[PDB]
């Protein structure tokens, strides 16, 4: 059976020996990358016993840092049906599909990726869904797609860069609202491989903080990842 | 060029090729691009070196993809001949992969070696 | 506990196949056309041929 | 790329301890059909290596 989660648009599917975090399928009948999903119809159709409309793609904390944060116990995710999310580092559009399933038909996901091949799979998924825009550009050059992105509510950041706080810094200084959401996945082995990960996490938080964000909470993703942090902060307020 | 994890000739290349030779003496060594590819796709691989002296480097550019998928460290040394007699083959080995077991000092040397490769990437 | 014990048993199966494939690769060294290094003899000594494959 | 197309005989042989197939789709190229005998499996190997390259 499926009950809602504490967040807006996130669902949790409780079964007999397990539970499965899941979103609502925006384009029904189609799995993106080959994942398990759930079909159910509205009631009054017990005589019918055929699932047609309602559909719920099962969301994997091993293939998604944001599902690793929601199962990691995050306070807010800043994204709701109706939001505008600027996704950074969008390889193949998988977690972009789950974010697009959260913000739904009236929302808008602004997917940015550097690579052309994940660009192509992103154009496949983003041709199937009509709330996600495909942007294949460098995230270190936001003035390339300044004609493409308006002021968004949330920025999600998953790039494996050493200058991650600078990239998200200038992207928020062009595209993120007054008092904006920011949700960064951090890999301590990717920023500084010879330093301890708590010190790398605290130093990246300090670089956001002198980059004039405001850190609300930090959690480490560690039944599902190693040396990964998820920092939830808010721009200028 | 496409060799962005380029190993430096000041003795990191030398420690790479020396650990190649010691793994060759412990039989932990899959030699050549195809057998390297089999070890990475099967996930046995603990570390993988390539050679940037490849005359078309496209024929070894395919394994950094699956090494990024399997999350194993790869690094390029600038001579397939030095890698070839580092293995002990009498031909030019273009890309080598070296696995590990449960308990060996070789596995310790792999651990410290991909610690240095992680200092590169 | 049930998926815990299935994790334990599946890891024991995979380590059994890993040690078995390692034993067969060592016997490819010990049963080779020319003297290669690798493997232990029954004395306890290990076979280290310091040659090259010409 | 040598054994593309012959996976039923191949995993039959590998799970049953028997002779693996020498070639797959490759056999209807212009070269391993040109050879005959042991040259068939031999040029199947080296054509498959050069064709991965």
């Amino acid at each position: 059976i499926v009950e809602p989660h504490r967040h807006k648009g996130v669902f949790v599917a409780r079964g007999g020996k397990e539970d499965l975090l899941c979103t609502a399928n925006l384009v029904p009948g189609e799995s993106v990358y080959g994942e398990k999903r759930i079909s159910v119809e509205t009631p009054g159709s017990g005589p019918d016993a055929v699932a047609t409309k309602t559909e719920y793609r099962i969301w994997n904390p091993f293939r998604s840092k944001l599902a690793a944060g929601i199962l990691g116990g995050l306070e807010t995710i800043y994204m709701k049906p109706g939001s505008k999310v600027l996704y950074l580092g969008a390889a193949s559009g998988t977690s972009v599909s789950h974010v697009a399933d959260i913000v739904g038909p009236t929302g808008a996901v602004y997917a940015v990726e550097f690579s052309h091949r994940s660009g192509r799979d992103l154009i496949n998924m983003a041709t199937r869904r009509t709330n996600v825009i495909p942007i294949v550009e460098d995230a270190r050059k936001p003035m390339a797609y300044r004609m493409l992105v308006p002021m968004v509510d949330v920025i999600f950041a998953d790039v494996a860069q050493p200058d991650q706080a600078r990239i998200v810094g200038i992207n928020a200084r062009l595209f993120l609202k007054q008092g904006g959401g920011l949700l960064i996945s951090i890999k301590a082995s990717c920023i500084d491989s010879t330093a301890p990960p708590e010190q790398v996490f605290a130093s990246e938080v300090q670089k956001l903080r002198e980059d004039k964000f405001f850190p609300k909470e930090q959690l480490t993703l560690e039944p599902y990842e190693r040396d990964h942090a998820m920092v939830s902060c808010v721009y200028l307020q | 060029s496409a060799a962005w994890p380029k190993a430096e000739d000041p003795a990191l290349v030398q420690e790479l090729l020396d650990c190649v030779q010691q793994a060759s003496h412990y039989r932990q060594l899959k030699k050549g691009a195809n057998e390297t590819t089999k070890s990475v796709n099967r996930g046995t691989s603990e570390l993988v070196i390539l050679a940037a002296d490849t005359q078309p480097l496209s024929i070894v550019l395919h394994i950094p993809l699956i090494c990024e998928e399997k999350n194993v460290p790869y690094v390029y040394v600038p001579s397939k001949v030095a890698l070839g007699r580092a293995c002990g083959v009498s031909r030019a080995v273009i890309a080598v992969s070296l696995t590990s077991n449960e308990a060996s000092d070789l596995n310790s040397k792999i651990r410290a070696l991909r610690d240095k490769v992680e200092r590169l990437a | 506990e049930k998926l815990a014990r299935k994790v334990k048993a599946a890891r024991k199966k995979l380590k059994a196949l890993a040690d078995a494939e390692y034993e067969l690769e060592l016997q490819q060294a010990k049963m080779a056309k020319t003297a290669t290094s690798g493997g232990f003899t029954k004395s306890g000594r290990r076979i280290k041929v310091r040659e090259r494959k010409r | 790329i040598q054994i593309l197309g012959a996976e039923k005989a191949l995993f039959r042989a590998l799970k049953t301890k028997h002779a693996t197939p020498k070639y797959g789709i490759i056999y209807h190229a212009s070269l391993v059909g040109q050879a005959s005998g042991p040259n068939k499996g031999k040029i199947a190997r080296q054509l498959a290596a050069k064709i991965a390259l």
């Binding site: 039944p223 | 099967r42 | 196949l17 494939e21 | 042989a13």
Partner: peptide, 26 residues
């Protein structure tokens, strides 16, 4: 060795999937 390699391939896939479901249960 061909048989042991194929059985290790199948068992490695089973351990990846079953460990993923295990950490999904806890």
């Amino acid at each position: 060795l061909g048989y042991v390699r194929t059985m290790r391939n199948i068992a490695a896939k089973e351990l990846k999937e079953l460990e993923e479901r295990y950490v999904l249960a806890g």
